[PDB]
Design an enzyme around this catalytic site. Sequence first.
Site, short mmCIF file in Angstrom:
data_model
loop_
_atom_site.label_atom_id
_atom_site.label_comp_id
_atom_site.label_asym_id
_atom_site.label_seq_id
_atom_site.Cartn_x
_atom_site.Cartn_y
_atom_site.Cartn_z
N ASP A 22 -4.82 -6.55 -11.33
CA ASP A 22 -5.95 -6.85 -10.43
C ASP A 22 -6.49 -5.56 -9.84
O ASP A 22 -5.75 -4.59 -9.66
CB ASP A 22 -5.54 -7.82 -9.31
CG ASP A 22 -6.69 -8.72 -8.86
OD1 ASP A 22 -7.62 -8.20 -8.17
OD2 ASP A 22 -6.66 -9.93 -9.20
N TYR B 91 -24.82 -14.64 -15.60
CA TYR B 91 -23.48 -15.19 -15.74
C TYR B 91 -23.37 -16.01 -17.02
O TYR B 91 -22.41 -15.86 -17.78
CB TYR B 91 -23.13 -16.05 -14.54
CG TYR B 91 -21.73 -16.63 -14.62
CD1 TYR B 91 -20.63 -15.88 -14.24
CD2 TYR B 91 -21.51 -17.96 -15.04
CE1 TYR B 91 -19.36 -16.41 -14.30
CE2 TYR B 91 -20.24 -18.48 -15.11
CZ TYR B 91 -19.18 -17.71 -14.74
OH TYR B 91 -17.89 -18.25 -14.76
#
Lengths: 253, 253, 253, 253
Positions: free
Chosen positions: C37, C151
Amino acid sequence: GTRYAGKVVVVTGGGRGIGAGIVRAFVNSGARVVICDKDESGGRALEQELPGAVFILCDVTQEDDVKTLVSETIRRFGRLDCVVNNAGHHPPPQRPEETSAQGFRQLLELNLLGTYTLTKLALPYLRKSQGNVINISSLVGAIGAAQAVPYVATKGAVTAMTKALALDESPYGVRVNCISPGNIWTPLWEELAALMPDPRASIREGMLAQPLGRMGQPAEVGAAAVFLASEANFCTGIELLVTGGAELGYPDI
Amino acid sequence: GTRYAGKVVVVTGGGRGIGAGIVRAFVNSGARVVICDKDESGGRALEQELPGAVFILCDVTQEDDVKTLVSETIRRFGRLDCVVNNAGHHPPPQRPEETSAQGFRQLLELNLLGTYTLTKLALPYLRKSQGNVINISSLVGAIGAAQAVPYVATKGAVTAMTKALALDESPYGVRVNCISPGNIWTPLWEELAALMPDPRASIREGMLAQPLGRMGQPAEVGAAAVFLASEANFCTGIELLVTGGAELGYPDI
Amino acid sequence: GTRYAGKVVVVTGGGRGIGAGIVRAFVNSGARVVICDKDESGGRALEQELPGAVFILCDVTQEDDVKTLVSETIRRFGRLDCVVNNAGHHPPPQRPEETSAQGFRQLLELNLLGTYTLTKLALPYLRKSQGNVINISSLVGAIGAAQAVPYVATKGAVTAMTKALALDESPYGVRVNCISPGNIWTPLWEELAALMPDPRASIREGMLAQPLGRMGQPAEVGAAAVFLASEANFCTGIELLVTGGAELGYPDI
Amino acid sequence: GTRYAGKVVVVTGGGRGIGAGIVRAFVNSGARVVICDKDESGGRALEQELPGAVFILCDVTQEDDVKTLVSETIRRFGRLDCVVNNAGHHPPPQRPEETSAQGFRQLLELNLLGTYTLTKLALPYLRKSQGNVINISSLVGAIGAAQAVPYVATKGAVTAMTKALALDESPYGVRVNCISPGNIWTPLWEELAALMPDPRASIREGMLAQPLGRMGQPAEVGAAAVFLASEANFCTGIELLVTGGAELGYPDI
Ligand SMILES: NC(=O)c1ccc[n+]([C@@H]2O[C@H](COP(=O)([O-])OP(=O)(O)OC[C@H]3O[C@@H](n4cnc5c(N)ncnc54)[C@H](O)[C@@H]3O)[C@@H](O)[C@H]2O)c1
Ligand SMILES: NC(=O)c1ccc[n+]([C@@H]2O[C@H](COP(=O)([O-])OP(=O)(O)OC[C@H]3O[C@@H](n4cnc5c(N)ncnc54)[C@H](O)[C@@H]3O)[C@@H](O)[C@H]2O)c1
Ligand SMILES: NC(=O)c1ccc[n+]([C@@H]2O[C@H](COP(=O)([O-])OP(=O)(O)OC[C@H]3O[C@@H](n4cnc5c(N)ncnc54)[C@H](O)[C@@H]3O)[C@@H](O)[C@H]2O)c1
Ligand SMILES: NC(=O)c1ccc[n+]([C@@H]2O[C@H](COP(=O)([O-])OP(=O)(O)OC[C@H]3O[C@@H](n4cnc5c(N)ncnc54)[C@H](O)[C@@H]3O)[C@@H](O)[C@H]2O)c1
Ligand SMILES: O=C(c1ccc(F)c(O)c1)c1cccc(-c2ccc(O)c(O)c2)n1
Ligand SMILES: O=C(c1ccc(F)c(O)c1)c1cccc(-c2ccc(O)c(O)c2)n1
Ligand SMILES: O=C(c1ccc(F)c(O)c1)c1cccc(-c2ccc(O)c(O)c2)n1
Ligand SMILES: O=C(c1ccc(F)c(O)c1)c1cccc(-c2ccc(O)c(O)c2)n1
Ligand SMILES: OC[C@H]1O[C@@H](O)[C@H](O)[C@@H](O)[C@@H]1O
Ligand SMILES: OC[C@H]1O[C@@H](O)[C@H](O)[C@@H](O)[C@@H]1O
Ligand SMILES: OC[C@H]1O[C@@H](O)[C@H](O)[C@@H](O)[C@@H]1O
Ligand SMILES: OC[C@H]1O[C@@H](O)[C@H](O)[C@@H](O)[C@@H]1O
Ligand code: NA
Ligand code: NA
Ligand code: NA
Ligand code: NA
């Protein structure tokens, strides 16, 4: 051995081929399984082999057979959690002009209406258990195939029916999904290949039709079914492809 | 008026609704059209209205009716270039437990097997003309719908059958394609809405189910059919969506 | 606890949301997991919580970060069996004229090219282990959505890329599949809803967009990922829908 | 010669190949056409050949080129009705490990972002005319292909973007659709084949990849584009396959 413990599953055409692999997968998951088949030979041996599986003779095209299948499952095990509609047939290759309306009707009876009838009779019990339906369709229902107009039409119907019923049963918490296999090595595959001029060439062609370079196994369809029943709790109305990649990929006059 | 000049087209269920719009589109393109319908009322009036269209009474579920349809088309016009399999029906909304196997069989006879039978009898003439087949399926065969398990299953079968036959007939130069309409404003739509508690609300809901904010017109399906017949010479086995965008687009326990 | 024993898995964006659920699912299956992450907060806590999971700070848009991610995974655990490309972002709703080419490029960097880069650097090790790739795409890549042109475009690219790479890697025994979730209740969902005029109404609308009447859970995506990695050995190039049925189902002027 | 009379169309990459066929189809329909291309050679000759077509030099990856393209179209013809986003490229076959992130970014710039930029700048004028957008995508975006991870990813993005924008522009009456061709015989096809060990074998393989047994023609893509612009008034967000049937159709260890 615990993923589907305490659950009761009916697998139609469970005596050999894909159906027997699905039976084995669910027993291995901890479920009790009712093997439905029109033929005694394989299913009876499977019931002796597998603690937790029992055999009930039932032709899914005979409504009274299916009624008795469901009532005997409930009488013997007290609940019903999952129905796997696997019974079906692929005729030998047939040119369109060699098919008949009556042959088409007969194949619809097995591949489509037998799935419909068991599902209808099972749904009251599936609603009580928040159970689920798994239909075994085919890749060729989605993309077509040659020399198989009736077979392709029946599997297109199964896949669409799966989506319609998923919508209807969603308010009651019953999921309805299908598996579309590609080439799976089963006795049906072996029987069809044996009708070809060169059976060994037909099998080799079947193996190489997949990017993965082999045919699938009944156990692999079975693992997909156990996933849909036991772990796919947000999936309904899906078509799960188990094809080895067959649908991937591929002067002007 | 010349895009499909000199060609002969058969449209089943051509007496009203989508079928009549397809008839009008092909006449406007320069074709001669045979209107097939089980009902006299609309098709007879259409034959009087349209030079270039004639009416033949024919129930596509009756094989001998269809045999006579094809033989009369050839006897009267000398060739056959395109078959549009439009005849079909949508029953009233029905919960799955309210359906019957026998009702399902009857709907398969019209929506699936009548398309099969006309196509089979026409294919020898389509091969001579390098003609083509256009089946009228439905969007809900692809994505499902509620309270319509039999209807959805029949249209899934039509779409899949289209792809299978396209593969079988490609070596002979005959293309086979389908149109999947969404909400089209027709007498069938009007009849179903009239059965609802609030018909006007049902129609309003139907209009707003499309991003384009209206239902489609028979003439718009007809233009898609004329395109497939006359200009889509590298298209076979496709599903042409005429839906206004209905399929586009759309705490954890 | 044994379905994926002895295996090593990398999950990008594993610090919260879907990624954290995938991490938990693989640990529960017996695998060792590397949590990647760009943010320390969630992933560091997850590494303290879960024996068998470790955290490596890595921004998947920074090629040298990803190089070090892969080399550290091999240095610490000696093999690599599965890469889950979950890191990604959904911007706030944007009208097409409110988007920019530069914003589109940035979203491509995360949602598409970060998946590409990790997969490329991992493939030599996946070939040695006959491992597999799982990309987290989206339902809206397949069916579209409003106010999200960039997106939607990135997820259409991920799904297609999955199929291309599945073809390229099939000769080496490496499967490549994707999961397309629908509405999953995650911190991203919560953050976007909080930007709406009525957040609670937005969440209610999101729950009812599925026939199943709720949003999905990260654990449900995680179960689908463990299935693809550990039991879907004849699946490659598939798109596994985890959507609750959102894609099912739905005056002329 | 009247189906699209009085209308103004922009075709990117219109100097040769598919784009030139689209140009010819729209001129033949009665439209005025602006040929956009980064190369002078073909488009300049096309402008001399075709009354009703004019050439504007424009590289769709250069935003200021595209701004001037749109403003010059309006200055010269007073309206804009249809944009055909055809400019694009297929790189030579490349194994995944032979691709680069930077090469991928460059291909995204042409195949995806150039389509995005022209559409964005044209939409204010398309809303005034209730015009429409036609994107030229590819079959391999839907089904994948080998040795083409970046190309496949860009076309998956174009097809998905088409659906998103169709949803966003539907309230304003602007339709957005795409065409997905299969093998079309163009100079790009000829150039790629010439890089192969056996070019003639590569072309023969390309011809036989379709059930119809030939490659498609630019004129056939052009007819599909004219249909979408002029007659498909209830179609938005669709993917029109022009592939000759390539997507149809196709020991266990
Ligand atoms: N084998 C493949 O490659 C393949 C691919 C895609 C789909 N399928 C589907 O998978 C399913 C199983 O196929 P298979 O290859 O295992 O076939 P199979 O012929 O090897 O086994 C089918 C089993 O179903 C039983 N059965 C047949 N008719 C029945 C009836 N009326 N009532 C009850 N049982 C009946 C048979 O007796 C047999 O035991 C079928 O629906 C088939 O269409 C198979
Ligand atoms: N209207 C819609 O929204 C819609 C949407 C998708 C698909 N469809 C399909 O389009 C087709 C036409 O639908 P419609 O709305 O125009 O219906 P409609 O009921 O208005 O018209 C159907 C016509 O077919 C005829 N017909 C019915 N059974 C027949 C038979 N056995 N033999 C010959 N003719 C017969 C009827 O008499 C009628 O003239 C059907 O296949 C339907 O499933 C309709
Ligand atoms: N939540 C949904 O409804 C939904 C639906 C469909 C698809 N998805 C996809 O699922 C994935 C996860 O979504 P989510 O809702 O869990 O999101 P989230 O925002 O809750 O979690 C995303 C995680 O990825 C990390 N991340 C972001 N950019 C990164 C980068 N450059 N490098 C490394 N890590 C990075 C974040 O820090 C965070 O921990 C995304 O690809 C998203 O597009 C989500
Ligand atoms: N040929 C096929 O088999 C095939 C199949 C599917 C999709 N496609 C797509 O169809 C489209 C056209 O392909 P084609 O085979 O005709 O290609 P082509 O190479 O023959 O023609 C492409 C044209 O676009 C122009 N062009 C390229 N980059 C440009 C830029 N930056 N700005 C402006 N113009 C530019 C070129 O100069 C050329 O005139 C492409 O999007 C391609 O991906 C082609
Ligand atoms: O049962 C078969 C099968 C194969 C794949 C499927 F997807 C499917 O649903 C069924 C099978 C087995 C062996 C040969 C064939 C076959 C061979 C030639 C054909 O023309 C054909 O349509 C099918 N099908
Ligand atoms: O004929 C109809 C129709 C509508 C859309 C289709 F795609 C289709 O193939 C058929 C129609 C007309 C009016 C109402 C309905 C309808 C309404 C409620 C339902 O539950 C349903 O399944 C259908 N369908
Ligand atoms: O992250 C979201 C999401 C939701 C569903 C997806 F399939 C997906 O890939 C992402 C999300 C969460 C909350 C709201 C929204 C949303 C709301 C309005 C919109 O116009 C929109 O495009 C997205 N999307
Ligand atoms: O431009 C081509 C093409 C062909 C088909 C398409 F659908 C497409 O979008 C593009 C083309 C032309 C000649 C050869 C090839 C080709 C050959 C081998 C390949 O490995 C490959 O990915 C593409 N593609
Ligand atoms: O007959 C082909 C194959 O059928 C499968 O169902 C069996 O599991 C295999 O043992 C057999 O080789
Ligand atoms: O009844 C609904 C509609 O049906 C269509 O087929 C007719 O063309 C319309 O005139 C009519 O309004
Ligand atoms: O924030 C929304 C949800 O995100 C998920 O990832 C967490 O598992 C939940 O505990 C939380 O409620
Ligand atoms: O170069 C291949 C082909 O390209 C097409 O765009 C042209 O129309 C043809 O004349 C040419 O043969
Ligand atoms: Na037993
Ligand atoms: Na007449
Ligand atoms: Na740890
Ligand atoms: Na000119």
